[PDB]
Design a protein around this ligand. Structure first.
Ligand SMILES: NC(=O)c1ccc[n+]([C@@H]2O[C@H](COP(=O)(O)O)[C@@H](O)[C@H]2O)c1
Ligand SMILES: NC(=O)c1ccc[n+]([C@@H]2O[C@H](COP(=O)(O)O)[C@@H](O)[C@H]2O)c1
Ligand SMILES: NC(=O)c1ccc[n+]([C@@H]2O[C@H](COP(=O)(O)O)[C@@H](O)[C@H]2O)c1
Ligand SMILES: NC(=O)c1ccc[n+]([C@@H]2O[C@H](COP(=O)(O)O)[C@@H](O)[C@H]2O)c1
Ligand SMILES: NC(=O)c1ccc[n+]([C@@H]2O[C@H](COP(=O)(O)O)[C@@H](O)[C@H]2O)c1
Ligand SMILES: NC(=O)c1ccc[n+]([C@@H]2O[C@H](COP(=O)(O)O)[C@@H](O)[C@H]2O)c1
Lengths: 161, 161, 161, 161, 161, 161
């Protein structure tokens, strides 16, 4: 019983961590696809796929979730939405259910015959607070804040803006 | 102390498993990049990236190596060799040493300033035995043989040939 | 005497059908290129190229226009506008005149030395009525409405929105 | 009842025409996909997709097959074999059976759940005779020979060689 | 001592010429990269890379700057910002300093370890005056105005708009 | 009166230099396109486009040819031969004649309506001597040998082999 979740994780926030835990209550393993793995250094997508892999890895580990319970797979975007589901399939282990609140992701997997569950704190809010010197830290697990400090994430986002 | 190993894993054999174990003796974690993640269904590259993720995952787990000791990241190839190292960096956590016996991989990482260690049983031999009805099973961990049977790998390779 | 018309046909409406008929009065055959053949499942481009081929095919046939009078060729977009005309040429039979009301299409073919005729009811209006439950059906040939019902087009566009 | 046939048609020969006729005995319409639509001016792929569309169009028409019985759709190749079937689907009307003698095409459609029928005179032979001044004309329908003369096909292939 | 400057040059204006001269006071040679070399015929990017090469070439020559003092290299954009610096490196001679006022360009080269100097009259203003019949000519070197007249640049931009 | 020459220049040899000089006797300026600008670090294409720009630049300068007499423009390859000529046009200043001994290049430009002149010492021979420790230096201008030593070209080619 393997589920699949897709998200840009720009950056990985508390809400996403919560949803991952709830998901792990109903499936044995979870494939966590980091979408738009090719985008970085922009206002909407500040971090590279590798940096996000670290954010997810450190955060899940720090929250006690065993590494054997999930797969972290960066997935580049493609121009043709009609092939994106096949694109994901080709890069991942088999899965039974898909979790997403993204209308496009839901519709594509749904048309493909997959059971789509929408999940029961938004990157936008987080990146906006980093830019306006608001309180972004409280919206993220401490392990993630730590990675962002280590890679100079705020310094990057501010210079880009 | 994180190392990086790159290979097509078509399919993941005993020799590669042995090398992974030896590598894990000198580094804390190992990033295992599955190269040519975009190629599948050909004589040289029979399996999709997702199928190889399963082969690696099951095999490492079955050999007792904890999931927290490694990262499995499928990496698509790119046309420009000159950017491939940056391509890998962008998709992965930071690493200190690179392990490879592939001249091209060694040279590219070397020119980039990385310390390249060549590893102390070849996909070609394995795929050739699958095609000629030779003894391919003995060259692979049993968990891998199991995945290949589950996905009808031999049936696929024979029809393609 | 072969003409060429390019359009996204998202979806194929009454106005476009009318223009096609008028065009067929002055040329023997018409090459109908379905532009942006790679885009689907978005607000501006709901339908795949194949679905649009069906919309065009059924509609022209239903309006009595013989199949031998035209060619339906899906054309993917390319990043470089400067090569798009050559792109179209490479995928199509030879043509003498180009019909379009799209400034970009007119300018590109014009710079290439082609005679461009602007045609003597807009996808946008159609898709907006599908979304707002307005009267979209009356803007389209009945064969097209039929295809949209068969492929659940409205259900798709609403979920995406 | 719609079938699908895929081929490079470099150039369209007598054997392929024969197979198309036999296929049209068991299905109402046939989607004829011209594969490798992006390749031209090489020894293995001399002609552009548009030139092949003309070869097919003229030949089928000349052999009395009504235009309403088929669809000619040029299809560009893609790097990932795993997505090629979805690629074809996205560009075409729905189909029930697939006809091919190409192992790769058969395997891909088969894995996708499609019924694949292998067809009951080879481009290679044709192009080899064009190059060695052998008898290529007899291997092709006269309408095709005519198109090749009109576009200077032999002159092209010889200069390239 | 070689510097590097990157810009779209849509079109090459007086301000950019001034900056190039000042730059040539502190470095022996200057690599001038024409960014977005693949974009043309749009409101933001009217001219092809080749047309811009002519604008730069004629203007620098006309202002007395010796050809041996610079390199004009058109550079296509790429999707992954993380590899763009390596992309530039691969296409150019070695350079010691980078000059730019573009935050993204500055940040990318900075993260790569390069010394970035922001330069001590904007394409947007120029293109806006061409469209509104304002005074665009005075914002450009006369050699550039001449190239634009020769290629019918204004006629193009107006038709596109 | 501007001519155009295309070559991979892997590496730039004496014969190519000779041809460039002869060409400069019949045209005012010469556009020298470095083909396959995206390929590097392989047996057939050892050097990056930037390294080749240096080889050409230094060699022409050293042979007394004024920089104002030519343009060095790296050109990436594209999959569709049918668009390659338009690709070159888009990246370059206008030209009147094309010089090449490459059948494909000759045929493509010829079909496009261009006057193609075949030129009145082969990279292959040069790279083979670098690999077999033969006498490669004598086949190249000294400025080129110098660049190769500076970038460790032989060390690279040998490791790759
Ligand atoms: N490449 C595609 O065609 C395509 C289609 C749907 C979703 N996606 C990706 O799914 C991810 C979903 O991200 P979020 O819901 O966090 O925005 C994004 O990275 C998005 O780009 C990709
Ligand atoms: N895309 C590239 O330019 C490039 C350069 C070097 C190696 N690779 C990849 O590294 C992997 C190494 O594989 P093996 O040593 O098992 O063959 C392959 O997947 C290869 O394609 C990619
Ligand atoms: N790929 C390109 O560079 C390019 C240039 C001009 C037009 N087109 C296509 O032409 C079609 C024209 O569509 P409409 O006029 O219906 O919008 C579109 O599909 C558009 O994308 C493509
Ligand atoms: N782009 C792909 O991944 C892919 C996979 C299988 C077949 N094809 C195409 O199918 C066609 C079959 O051609 P023939 O059997 O005549 O060779 C070819 O154009 C081939 O390139 C494409
Ligand atoms: N392709 C990329 O990822 C990327 C990243 C940064 C800048 N660029 C280019 O740098 C150039 C800078 O142009 P300007 O500062 O004149 O706008 C542009 O052509 C821009 O597209 C490219
Ligand atoms: N990208 C293409 O479709 C295409 C077509 C013809 C030639 N070329 C290039 O022209 C150059 C000619 O090189 P040489 O004659 O030295 O081999 C090469 O870089 C070749 O790749 C590119």
């Amino acid at each position: 019983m393997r589920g699949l979740l897709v998200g840009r994780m720009q950056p990985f926030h508390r809400g996403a961590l919560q949803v991952i835990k709830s998901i792990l209550e109903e499936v044995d393993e979870l494939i966590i696809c980091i979408g738009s793995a090719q985008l970085s250094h922009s206002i909407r997508d500040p971090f590279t796929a590798g940096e996000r892999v670290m954010m997810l890895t450190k955060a899940l580990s720090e929250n006690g979730i065993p590494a054997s319970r999930y797969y972290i797979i960066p997935v580049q975007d493609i121009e043709c939405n009609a092939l994106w589901v096949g694109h994901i399939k080709m890069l991942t282990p088999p899965f039974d259910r898909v979790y997403s609140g993204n209308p496009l992701v839901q519709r594509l997997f749904s048309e493909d015959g997959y059971e789509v569950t929408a999940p029961p704190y938004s990157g936008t809010e987080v990146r906006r607070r980093m830019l306006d010197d608001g309180d972004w830290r409280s919206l993220l697990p401490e392990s993630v804040v730590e990675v962002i400090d280590e890679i100079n994430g705020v310094e990057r986002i501010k210079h880009l803006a």
